[PDB]
Design a protein around this ligand. Sequence first.
Ligand code: HEO
Ligand code: HEM
Ligand SMILES: [Cu+2]
Lengths: 658, 96, 184, 260
Amino acid sequence: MFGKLSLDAVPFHEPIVMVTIAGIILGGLALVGLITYFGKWTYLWKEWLTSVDHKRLGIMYIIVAIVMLLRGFADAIMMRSQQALASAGEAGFLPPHHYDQIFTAHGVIMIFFVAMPFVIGLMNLVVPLQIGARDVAFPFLNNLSFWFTVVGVILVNVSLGVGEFAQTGWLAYPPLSGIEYSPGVGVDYWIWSLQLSGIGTTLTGINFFVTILKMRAPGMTMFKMPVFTWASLCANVLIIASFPILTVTVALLTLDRYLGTHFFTNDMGGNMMMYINLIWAWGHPEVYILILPVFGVFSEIAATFSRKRLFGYTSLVWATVCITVLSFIVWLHHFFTMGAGANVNAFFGITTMIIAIPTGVKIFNWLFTMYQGRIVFHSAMLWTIGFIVTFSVGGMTGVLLAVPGADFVLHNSLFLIAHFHNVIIGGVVFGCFAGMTYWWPKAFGFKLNETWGKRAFWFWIIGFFVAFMPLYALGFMGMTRRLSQQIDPQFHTMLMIAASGAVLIALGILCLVIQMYVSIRDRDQNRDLTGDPWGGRTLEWATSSPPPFYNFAVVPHVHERDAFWEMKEKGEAYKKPDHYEEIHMPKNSGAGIVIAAFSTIFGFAMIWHIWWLAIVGFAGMIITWIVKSFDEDVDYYVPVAEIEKLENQHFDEITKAG
Amino acid sequence: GSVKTYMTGFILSIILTVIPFWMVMTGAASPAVILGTILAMAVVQVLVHLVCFLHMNTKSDEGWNMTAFVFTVLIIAILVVGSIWIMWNLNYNMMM
Amino acid sequence: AGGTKIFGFWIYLMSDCILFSILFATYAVLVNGTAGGPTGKDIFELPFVLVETFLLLFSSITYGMAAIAMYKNNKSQVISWLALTWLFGAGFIGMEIYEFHHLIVNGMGPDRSGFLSAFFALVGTHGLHVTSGLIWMAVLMVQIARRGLTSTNRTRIMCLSLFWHFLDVVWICVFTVVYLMGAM
Amino acid sequence: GCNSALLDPKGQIGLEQRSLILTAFGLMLIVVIPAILMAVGFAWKYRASNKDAKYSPNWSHSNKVEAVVWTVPILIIIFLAVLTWKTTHALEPSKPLAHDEKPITIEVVSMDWKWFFIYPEQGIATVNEIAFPANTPVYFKVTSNSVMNSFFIPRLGSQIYAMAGMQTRLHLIANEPGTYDGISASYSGPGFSGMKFKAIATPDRAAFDQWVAKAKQSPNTMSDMAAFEKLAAPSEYNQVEYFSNVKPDLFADVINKFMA
Ligand code: HEO
Ligand code: HEM
Ligand SMILES: [Cu+2]
């Protein structure tokens, strides 16, 4: 109502943004109408929105990541179509003013709100189950982290509705993203979205790091955990040691933009290059945060579907620890073209090359896990094989790019985009879909349709090759990134092929949606009765396919590496305990959503320079936190009756199915 | 910990704060010495604060009070030294 | 239960160590940033920094005495020591605010040079950390006065001890690097 | 692409960079190709359907296999890292080329959505075009009047950044006379697509002197900072322009605009 906000902040004239806003608002209105009609408001509030259960927060991360993937891929389609039309000597349909917004928003969404939400969803879903714990160390902290991520997502989406988004790339390099050269409010949207998302992610990292070390099942030493728990611990260590760098960097840029300081300005002795260093000091650990958990997932799948013990457990854990250690001394490999001395460039090139060895070791351990096993061609196993094949080429191109000599001409070219898209699609989203199809029974109690899954996998891999292999050739031809208008016609053909690839990936995404739909429709015929659909090695498969809000009635005792496999081999897998005991559990808290709403108001007011509203929002956040610090009734006791009833129902299911 | 260790830490902190301040305000030595000695006294005071006041011990949390702190010190020694070195090189290579 | 919360707060303090190390590196890069403006030697008053350091050290010692009294299962002693610690912290924040006001009024604000911007950023970050500690002490004292020394209260006191001693260590590093070394 | 800009370069630096790319490609192939081949081989040969395939559900560790897995990557990284050190120390843009002919100094100021070039020795100025005789070293001193940009001629060789108030050095030599495309490799804003220029490697010196004389005939002059700022106005898809008279120290003044 005050500040820069006015009737001119909404783009009336531009049709594309208005039809996008109409689509989003009608979708929201239809969802609200359906929820009201079914009267599930109370159930959603008391079971999902205020849930402190790790499984619910994991599923809700998966939902957020899936719904944001649609917006990301829509931006990808729009960019590819614009490039294809511009290559044919046409004006196209996307002015630079819109193309810059589109690619910046696409990058930010697909990095911060598609990959991290899905990966952290998988962690919340399985990590507490695998270690044999009932919940996480800080449940309310997990809920608050979820709501902070949702606040970031809301700010990014509402950026389209009112005002504009950043036009400075997904990392907002200082001189362009400065107050002098970017007078718009888009950079403020970027700043506050990433700040609040970073706060959420830091809290998540601390929570998981404490949970893994402190709340392990008795008799399970560090070198007896499942490999996914190792990868998650490494990723959380990276989050804790990295995200402060992003927080400080964005805080310095917003100080420059608001109070008119000279941290990164080109004048009054500001050092602009500093920002780049800092952001990349945070930038390169981030990608390992995306790639470490998915490795674990594949390891788990390699264990489950090869029907044999995983190869080189010690080698795998030492390789992931080596990756975690080396992922802090390699960031300069992002700007060899900045003009640093031969010594610094050579050193950073060599150290970036060194980290390749552990990844190769992990790939070879997976290959020898498939060596003399019985391989079942399930959806997850197809995802794993596709991941290995794609990620090998991705890593090859990466180590080629890590050489400063090659980097001097392949930097910011479509070769670099081919690299990072190649490795992301190969590892991150492949592991995401593999985990989603692999852990679906543990989240809902029924299996996914295999035919649609296989179709989606084939479409994804074929489309990815067709869309990104021409980008290698284009990068070789000298075509640079972020080109919108009057593209050299010599780059037309390859881009057209890329466009074909894009629509192929589209079909894959459509296939995925259809799969979920049919998986929901035919749930009554594909139920997971025994709780062990694929004979998984880890403890997570010991529980019923719908896990109780308490993960285990009795905390399991572990003596070996693969706990559940050893329990099945010994013949003691489903034994009725003599007696059940009252279980201490944490209560559902509603303060997370209140703090999230106050943070949303504060961020929005900061973006539009509504000072009083920002003060009100910040005061609301602090007051809600202080008030929730008072009450002591935060935990309750689950009685013996309910635990006995659920355990008897599960054992009856086991007996009838068995 | 006891009152005795806190009082000892307090006395050592008073000494390690007074000496550098008095040395700098008077220019009692060569600038190289006035830098090296104050950095040494600063790190000694940091260790005294960690031991006496923060009860920095190995046994607590089955050895994750040592490991976490040493790991973060290694990360700081990487990040700060790396940034300083990179910017020194990047500033030396753009002079006219 | 207290163990997990204390370990979590320790990991958060390690994250905050990384946060402050980034600001230290930024200041070290932009230490000579100032162009046609005040330098370290021109504006840094060493007596003021010495008084600030002694008052924050007094705050740390008083809070330590509060922790010992809490181990002694006494409420009044803990309340008195917490009040003295909060008074010392308030004095320190007062001096920092006075220094910032004096710098801004004299046309030497964070918008004048890179060096001044970095100095303001680092000392301001420490200031907001100390004022967060002060608000935490206020809420903790008002909780103790109405709840007594419970397990949750003991856990919160241990976490605030870790936070306050960490802030004192950070201030030691700050006055060593920024104030004392600059005025050399 | 066989006839690509990088795989068929015309400059020397391009030639060593292409050789380095091919050597690196060859070294990484020896490990990558077996990984994919073994992936497909183990997927097919050891499927659940096969009965004759040897089943080992307990073989989970092997010292020989682990040693073989660890060794080959280490050796490949050692060889390619030695090559990386040698090439990086031998392909620094901030390093004068070894050649008999004296280098020609070109100053590259990067205005918003256009390219500005100054020949101080020849005392001329150009917008979106350069020229230099073939088989002659060219010494680029690159700076940005504004937001970061990236000077890049794909066929000739290595790229560099242009940043405000900072001079960055680059060296390029053309082995074959002709016209080469030059772009910006750093997104500077809406007009970033606009940034495009042509490098003309003349067959002989005489053609270069003729081009310099033609530029000298331009009615427009760049003698004062006011004219420089008038040209520095935000404009998009700027045409090739010439300026006869240039201030002796214009690059220095452009850098000192930011007091650095
Ligand atoms: C999934 C995400 C992710 C991950 C994990 C990686 C990890 C790697 N990245 Fe890609 N990166 C990813 C996505 C990106 N990287 C980037 C930046 C980037 C840059 C700097 C950009 C530039 O110079 O212009 C280089 C050189 C590479 C190469 C590599 C290398 C060598 C690794 C290594 O850490 C791992 C590589 C994997 C290997 C090596 C496995 C293959 C090996 C096999 C079986 C063993 C064979 C043995 C040998 C080859 C010796 N990354 C950017 C920034 C984009 C931007 O600028 O905005 C993104 C998004
Ligand atoms: C699903 C298929 C995908 C397609 C077709 C796609 C397509 C594109 C395209 C065309 C660009 C612009 C490249 C250019 O400048 O010419 C781009 C940029 C980018 N994409 Fe994607 N993308 C996809 C998935 C992803 C995913 C999953 C992520 C993140 C994990 C991602 C992260 C990025 C980033 C960081 C950029 C750079 C943004 C910038 O330059 O500022 N992409 N993508
Ligand atoms: Cu990188």
